[PDB]
Symmetry: D2
């Protein structure tokens, strides 16, 4: 009868050298430097980059002493922006700071510092409990940076972007890898032709095997490398960057819903970051407890109130043990303390662990030890639901 | 058996006086001023505000001559930031500009200027085809600004935020208004007690009737006004703002998925904005054609390619006429040209219509005449699907 | 025969509220804050102000920890810029910092850090060894600020300027006060008419008596107060300010020659400041030793060399004891060690004494205890010249 | 009897690549670009440079449309700052603009826009009527830039400084060249040893002959080239620059007195620039009319008044024709209209001639055709004094 089209779902990542990620990384490098000397630091630090300029703005309350300019310059050199020839130089660029520095009992009862909504998500489709499209995109962006830093593929520059499109079935499940896009900055000594062969072998094919998805990468797949052509100049020049402009890359690649809150530059007292981490923790435990294959949980808060005004559990009809999302939600309310101060305490968030989160995703990081990734509430959830352990 | 909790879903809005929205508004005021003199202007303008400072950065290619500083200062005075006493003054604040100005046949075949994914959404639960929680939040933020500008409620200041939590049923449908939060900046002559009575009557109750949701606002509802207490100082001072930091408020309040792209400061050549508008157009027409009650469509693009690499139609089991989402998607591919240049042409996007979008939502605006809100593809969709008109 | 005109010589001062002096004061407040915690601080700090903005730039090498933004804001409130109504507000203005913090035996032999020339001057026409025109202008600017801060004259604002013109004789000597100009910022509650009566009595007439110049202020003198009319808005708005843009007001009002070097923002290792202070010390001692009535000494230096490349003593034919300027210069070379490290040691310059110098003149300050004002080399100079003590 | 020392007088110049001169040049490039399209442009433009940053601030009232960022970048490339390797790059540096653009009969009677004093000077010791020390320093700085741009001496970079010390007699007259200092930025391929031979021959010796001062350059002269050693990195990085920080280099090298006013960035309506130019015109005509060998004239003004409040002619006992400085001054008052609008009209100042003045001196420029250098009032002065023509 009426023709059917194949539904194609896409997620993207970027390198640490994409201007938005430079900002997220600088914001979180400042936050770590402050939490290292004063774990109680309140931090709302935003970064903006444009041609030859890094502008850091916002508010800090801290007892720590940190040199922000040297932190900025060293982070840019670590990413690889070390020359006017590459379009940006940590050693010779402008750095400007406009930050204002001034003007368990009660602890767990402190109000949210702001209103807002935050979402968390988990799926058993990958070992890291992450949607396949975003996971593959992050692996590709990380591998692109690795081949450059380890010299596996030479003549590469820091700025880069990755995009993965997967065909899906009528049940909303991933079926086949359809299209992979990789755009990387490079030296004038190399061209798209050289990059096409180098990246398809050392980045795309290597990641397909490293991720064990060969079964989804069989057949015909479109590979586009530098489809726009030469990419010699990259970074802030001709592409302004700002902190909190890659919130979907930082989370689940669009597979999960988002509340709009950015994470980088914010200390754990900001529900925009802490509550999103708590929701990832809750969702992962819900799936790890065998209550569902996929779970998305929204939490919401009123300024000056510790208890959430909202909570919303969705398992997309993958609910198990004959339990409804309403029943799973009641078990979440019994097991998890979602007051801001309780989240900081239970996840031990007052440590300099954030700069690592500021590129390649906050969630499903096999390479990091992040507390919101712990499946340490499975027994509590099944017990609360009167299920066998 | 195991206890059930009520699922509670939340969406928020902000006034034009919230620092992030000041940035979005200034970005889009610059874009309109350029499109008014040169409809072909290429515009990537980002705004950052902090204490006493407005910093505009990015790239313009235009034949137009516009005075950016006066555009900034006049827009701040229009929002109401006109005094150090209010925390920010359009007449005496810093304004800095770091913008680089330099360095139908083929038309419809031009490549996307970037890769990326964009989502569009529509629901028949409201006349404006918008999710109820975000629609109520936008109505509250708009009414809060209106009562101040028209003097219905005196002693109010520009900065404000609104949040609405709705109880939902097991079928993922809104059932009852549960909690409304309103936080507004104000003069020292008034306090939370005075605001509680004034806002609950002139803003919350007025909006409930104006929106015809009295049937969902019966019973017990929690109303919180300035729950954190006094809000005399607002705007950029002590709360830095950046363009593209309210993308969920700009779209569907978290009910729909998002690709991460910000809209303000970008000319229609940027798929981050144009493709999101096209997806709203497609989704609204899908629901207006009676093919579904709710529809979310993702579109994706590779840099240097005109045809999308991806498209993904989801109607959440509300599909009608015995049609699958695969069949609806094939009809969307027959009816809609989703090449960037085709979207600009069919929606007539090369006009100064964007500043109005930069607060109170880009979608479901009864007060504006926006081309992506037109249900002018219903006949084409039903025809393509061989349905009666 | 051919007609004679009366030669009229002019010098000016400004209040601490003039935008250039705001910059000098902020630069020297930062320098003092650093010298207070680390007397070895190397400091090259420049300040720029414009509408709503304070931008601090340059280089520091220090072990000290100081909060520059709070130092800026507190200094602006001390001057009186505390409202958008006054045109500038220390509490709500932008503050941006772009300062790089990184990348006796030998001591007295260290090279000059730069080349350059510096002049010093002294005259016995006043008790403070200062030219009469600049001394009167400084007294007027200080009195204008005092009447405002002590409330002697109400409704005054911080920004102000003073100018004094004196008639001179054919021997280049001051003969009579001819014209006094005072321009002050003010509240809208007062006008030029009210200021004319208030300032002429509480500022001009009071200073004439306080300085004991009634004998030069007899007869007809032109007094102009706010000759341009209203001065409600002042400070950086509509009048950008920069450090080192009032070098003549900082020195001798144009009576003496200048080498071009600014003083504020520079630690004592900078010959631009230290050598100018040494030349004031030498000139004052030359006149205090009875070797001349007026003396101007230029000193010059090559980068990487401790000994001056030049020295130039001029007494304008006021030389005494039958000694030439060549003979006085030889005695200066016997008495004074003018190597940069020797100047720092002999004048004890490594102390937070500079913020006080940053308005109302570096020289002839009766209200301060500055080491370059000490006449403690008179005995040494007369001895070296084989004169009676 | 008491020993005599030789009095040694010093003046300095800098290249167009010294950071202060970069600012003066950018300020005056903006002013020319505006005067070229709108000769009535009111312009108060200040430039600040530091590592990787160019910040332009102030006020413009104009009908002209100019692209300030491209003017900045092109001027930096013209000076030679075109690489991170050289320490600064016009193509990749930050450029920020904070300029406010808003908020014959009567003509000749307009008030001075500000109070202030300004000095002019002329001497017959050189053909250009300039003091020998500053003239030689300017010739050396210009030659240093020329050898680099024409490739006479390779491996040179833009930043450089020159200093000349001359021995003087007891009559205050130059007697012999004593010390010449040249410090130039350079490539790592060359060292001080190579520069010592190249600059002493192609710059110092060439200038001595080009200026015809071989008679003052006989005997023993100290030549110091890069006495501090290597100078690979120069420009704004590690040496902040500001407009109006080289006012002595711009005028007479300290031989003449100064009122403190900077010239660059100011349109001819600013007496700080116009009145200083008028005083150079008056002084040069006084000496060219045979009334003196050396002449210095100070002029002063009250805000809102067209007629000077002061004028002061000094010829240092070099007065001729048995005329006093009082008599010469009366003749100056008969011959010259020194109202601001009269100076603009008589010197035809409303033209884009200022960028050329912004390095290598405003006065005695043989290479430019500047109206304040015209000796076209000699006949009028001698006539007024009843002398033979
Ligand atoms: Na579905
Ligand atoms: Na559901
Ligand atoms: Na004289
Ligand atoms: Na003399």
């Amino acid at each position: 009868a009426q023709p059917t089209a194949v539904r194609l779902f896409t997620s993207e990542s970027v390198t640490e050298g994409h201007p938005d990620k430079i900002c997220d990384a600088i914001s979180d490098t400042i936050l770590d430097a402050l939490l290292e000397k004063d774990p109680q630091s309140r931090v709302a630090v935003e970064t903006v980059v444009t041609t030859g300029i890094v502008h850091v703005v916002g508010e800090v309350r801290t007892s720590a002493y940190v040199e922000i300019p040297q932190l900025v310059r060293n982070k840019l050199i670590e990413i690889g922006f070390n020359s006017s020839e590459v379009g940006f130089d940590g050693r010779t660029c402008g750095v400007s700071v406009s930050i204002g520095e001034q003007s368990v009992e009660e602890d767990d009862r402190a109000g949210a510092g702001d209103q807002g909504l935050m979402f968390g998500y988990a799926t058993n489709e990958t070992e890291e409990y992450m949607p396949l499209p975003i996971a593959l995109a992050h692996r590709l962006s990380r591998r692109l940076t690795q081949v450059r830093k380890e010299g596996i593929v030479p003549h590469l520059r820091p700025d880069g972007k990755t995009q993965v499109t997967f065909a899906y079935d009528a049940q909303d499940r991933p079926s086949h890898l359809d299209t992979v896009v990789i755009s990387t900055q490079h030296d004038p000594e190399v061209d798209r032709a050289w990059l096409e062969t180098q990246l398809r072998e050392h980045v795309i094919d290597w990641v397909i095997k490293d991720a064990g998805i060969e079964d989804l990468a069989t057949g015909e797949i479109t590979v586009l490398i530098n489809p726009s052509g030469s990419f010699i100049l990259g970074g802030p020049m001709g592409d302004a960057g700002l902190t909190g402009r890659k919130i979907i890359v930082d989370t689940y690649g669009g597979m999960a819903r988002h509340g709009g809150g950015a994470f980088s530059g914010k200390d754990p007292s900001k529900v925009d970051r802490s509550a999103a981490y708590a929701m990832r923790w809750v969702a992962k435990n819900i799936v790890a407890a065998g209550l569902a294959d996929r779970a998305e949980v929204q939490v919401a808060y009123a300024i000056g109130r510790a208890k959430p005004v909202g909570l919303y559990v969705e398992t997309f009809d993958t609910n198990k043990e004959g339990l409804s999302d309403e029943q799973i939600q009641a078990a979440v309310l019994e097991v998890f303390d979602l007051r801001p101060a309780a989240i900081i305490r239970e996840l031990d968030l007052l440590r300099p662990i954030y700069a690592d989160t500021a590129a390649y995703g906050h969630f499903g990081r096999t390479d990091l030890d992040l507390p919101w990734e712990a499946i340490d509430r499975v027994d509590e959830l099944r017990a609360a639901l009167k299920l066998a352990l």
